[PDB]
């Protein structure tokens, strides 16, 4: 509802029945109206009617005065002749209104009607101290003031009707003043005191934005809205050269010291505390409504002129009338900064440690030139000044923030006849084009504890203007001296407290400043930014000045905001030092550009190689058109010249000259404020910044580029204001990276430049979850003062229930919507000494339960379209999530009715559950909300007295245990790899004394309390080495249980009341110390790694734990005994089926031999038939190394067993029998029973099969419960493999299969194989055949070794590799000495020569081939020729042979003539 302002009087009373037409009673057509504009002189509009409205014509005439306002802060003055000054001429004049100027005339679709100006125009100021008379007309002046920001184009009429008088049938002239206000300006930089109360965040589109309700528009009038009982935050104003600020004061103010008795905050000179108005501090500053006399709304506007080009800071105290109700502060402070553009300056950073005499300046915004031309003039600020007064030898610091299409120009006076010696800093500015880049890391470190800021937000510290100019530096020192990270810096010495025993001389201060600026790193201009338009002019018009002029491109290729400095040092001549500290912002928007070139930049919206010849671009207001016609793969501006010759751009310059139809016209005619960027030493890419325009027709602009006789056309249709602009949906799809969902949105929440095209766009990412164990990463920050001031995180339920009302979304709503759903955060745990953890607070992770009963579909809204940051509008992201009905449960228990639907097995409210876990099962662990997590299950469990990490025992890599140890619900996948039978207990603690809210994790303090409480050894524990790339930790949403530093800092400031007349705001705010407690983690100095101190990306040090919750936990522990502590225990016991380790005959050589009658033959159970026999998976655990081989013997499958019974008469060779001597006799589970015979072999091994049928030529991944058979060569090439082949012909029973662990293993391997019989069954049915499953677990390595990989020209395993080509001989000599290992890899076409290499080798002659054992009897060769491949081999030379040896092997195509030769040497100059 709308409630009018102060209303009814005898001069403001409105009526709704008065109805008069625009023509009135004169009956004159509007077409024949004699109109002209109001006299506009020096900001003042006057309609002078003293000589116009005179009865001179027989008939009436209409003279209209048009007052058209587009410039803020005007004084509307209307002068029509006095009532009855002369008789018979001014006798019967009438006025509409006679109650003007408070009430005006509005057009109700046909009629002029009386209505108050305050309702359509908010911020009006009419002084009742000049219009107290009943009729303002006896003075003959109608005057009023209009606010500087209006959002409604309103028209009103004033009428001095002189036609009702009659002097001998002569009619007078009726004067009409037409006041028409259009929207100019968006928001005043300032504050408004709202008498209303704060209103809760209206989620979604339920916001009702009415302009009839004055309350709603008032909230949009200033940048700060001060509620008396909620807003503690001091008022702030920022004014630039030519800006307009103000304050809307309340009605309960008693007195104020702002704009008339301001306290100057001066750091350049010593403290002044006197009261000083804007008039004495600033010339030509204009203040409106000073006495606070206006009746409707008491707002004071201050217009700061362009004459002031110095930085000023002022403080104000607004004391409110002491009222009965409680308000946060009866006196509020106001900080007004005038003409400063860069906040958190490094000079303010320096002054808190070393005093600095300086004059900070803004670049001169040129009015006689283009708006985006700015200059800093050190010609008149580089004088020779010896320090004798506090003005001698000052620092002129010129600060200016450049944006899109903005250019800067510096001028120094460098002549030697006025200055004896002057230097330009740095020295490398001229020749190599480098600058002294100012990095913002030090301000990050000093202001890390003053806010909650990460690595990305701290670089935007130069973007936040509200309260970063306070003397916080004087406090930050204490924090900088408190920060254990800043101490280890090389740049500490300049921020150590200066000498006070002897007063520091300014010369030492300036020298220290020069060294502090010198130690910083230099960066090249041409490399940090791409396509810069820069000119270094050492010569002027009289050769007495130096200049540097650089134009900021439209899109900046800086990786991060380019914050640097330069200037001219003249202190070497005992004078001034001129310095410019400048910052270029990174434009975060895609350029609407036609890029036709085949090679294209990565930020052009139209990516056309040769697809389209004509590019249709509809350009809008504030749009950025790009036109590229050249190579983008050239970051230089020297070699791009060769392609400017092959490009023909029409017109010769674009978009300077542009095609309308087919004619070439200067672009400035259609767009007066257009900005064209033409790159130096280039023709294209050219750029057009479409300024604010005013068109009624789609204007077609056109250019064309001819590349290699191909003409491509850009036809940009700059639209009008009334073109159809519909909601544009940008759909992106979920991308599944490492079982976590990611969407490609990086700066679509970050505020970007406002545009009409920037409002009807919505970025929605569709995320479908149809599987288990996948984290849905949602990225939108927590609420903090800056580019994220009013971000909102709410959710709507589409399916199953359709509730279009937007509700709050937090950890609780997500926990309740989906059973046991978890909001988790990605952290990499710190050591116990630190107790902080690197959490990613901008990104959280939705984790869905293993079991899903209802299909859910929702939309998460991260809203930053309400945060307007310097006329830049942020984006909004919609995540359309669909969570499918997934039927998967965990084995275990639930200790209440909360997780019972998660477990197929449940013992509700039963403390200790015992579970037999079998190979590849999937166990879940979860305890009720409020019970204390004792275990890091399933990373760490309890063995019966001790804390033990069950991972290293069970080969538990590649398991959910490793990442699920800090959730509410933890998961674990049983492997087939076991070194023992292990019974552990996953125990959560129920302290019956007190339940908790354990959303935040439990600290090592209380976990040690429970270990010593529950007899759990934290001294005999093998540490679980951090194998996790991450941890999704279960914690509160955005640490809402933890403290908030911004609000608490400003809360202490507001209750410290720095806004009293006698109060000095500095000495009060310096007394503030940031609220900090044990809810935190210290930083130990010494390390195991440096990383526990530094942060990069999106990680920040925060305590996961709640020290209050922790102390309550420790209390309830120490006060109770063991009887009063419930233990929700899952006792998981794992039975490894007959653990066999592979018989390691050599360091390189393991063996899994199974030619036995107790192994696959089902063991003799109890004499009775038990049941359908269950496969006893015979467990061979083979632990090998890079360059290890495993041989595996099993009984021979019936078919090949017979085939070997055939060739029993036939013998092996020296090779195979040799290997035999090396293996069979060289092979717990060993036989004692009957000797193998053909009968029992055929019986028990009738049905023995071997999967994979080719062993190690295909394999079975052991953590793959699908037993997904894979070509290991496809996963790990570089192995030597013999499939399952019969050991001996004479013995039909035993076969073997071998494989080699390659030396470079890019990763851990964990697979398994099976000489599986379960098909043979005991005829008494004890057990089916036993399955011999060998579980192979190989470790990784990446050390390239001597060896020739003729399969590639870059081996990732060997050092040398020159891939062979048929018809080409490729020699690869490698130089080996005693005790060095080598290899060789031939491709499929070239087979080994010899095919017994390495065992046989060409002689030194390369004529004869010899068994290498002969020459060297201790060589360790790794190769098998009982294989399907004869192209890959490896070996090691022994430790005690040094006589000069030479040999070679070759990869020879059996078909064509191809030779890839490895030449192997030994030692060097020897026998």
From Swiss-Prot:
Function summary: Gametocyte surface protein required for male/female gamete fusion. Also required for male gamete exflagellation and interaction with host erythrocytes.
Subunit note: Heterodimer; heterodimerizes with PF45/48.
Annotated keywords: Cell membrane, Disulfide bond, Glycoprotein, Malaria, Membrane, Repeat, Signal
Coiled-coil region list: none
Disulfide bond sites: 47-65, 80-160, 191-235, 258-316, 594-615, 629-705, 654-703, 893-913, 927-988, 937-986, 1152-1180, 1194-1315, 1348-1372, 1386-1451, 1397-1449
Domain 6-Cys span(s) in chain numbering: 43-184, 187-341, 372-587, 590-729, 739-886, 889-1014, 1148-1341, 1344-1469
Entry protein name: Gametocyte surface protein P230
Disulfide bond as UniProt keyword: yes
Name of encoding gene: PFS230
Post-translational modification as stated in the protein's UniProt record: May be processed into a 310 kDa form as the parasite emerges from the host erythrocytes.
Keyword flag Membrane: yes
Biotech relevance: Promising transmission-blocking vaccine candidate: targeting the protein would prevents transmission of the parasite decreasing the malaria burden. The LMIV230-01 transmission-blocking antibody against the 6-Cys domain 1 also binds to the heterologous P.falciparum Malian isolate 20-2217-0 which carries a 'Ser-605' polymorphism and to the heterologous St Lucia strain which carries 'Ser-605' and 'Asn-661' polymorphisms.
Native organism: Plasmodium falciparum (isolate 3D7)
Compartments where found: Cell surface; Cell membrane
Carbohydrate-modified residues: 39, 275, 283, 343, 415, 533, 543, 607, 721, 754, 906, 946, 962, 1075, 1078, 1207, 1238, 1316, 1354, 1388, 1406
Source lineage: Eukaryota, Sar, Alveolata, Apicomplexa, Aconoidasida
Highest taxon in the source lineage: Eukaryota
Main location: other
Cellular compartments per GO CC: cell surface; plasma membrane
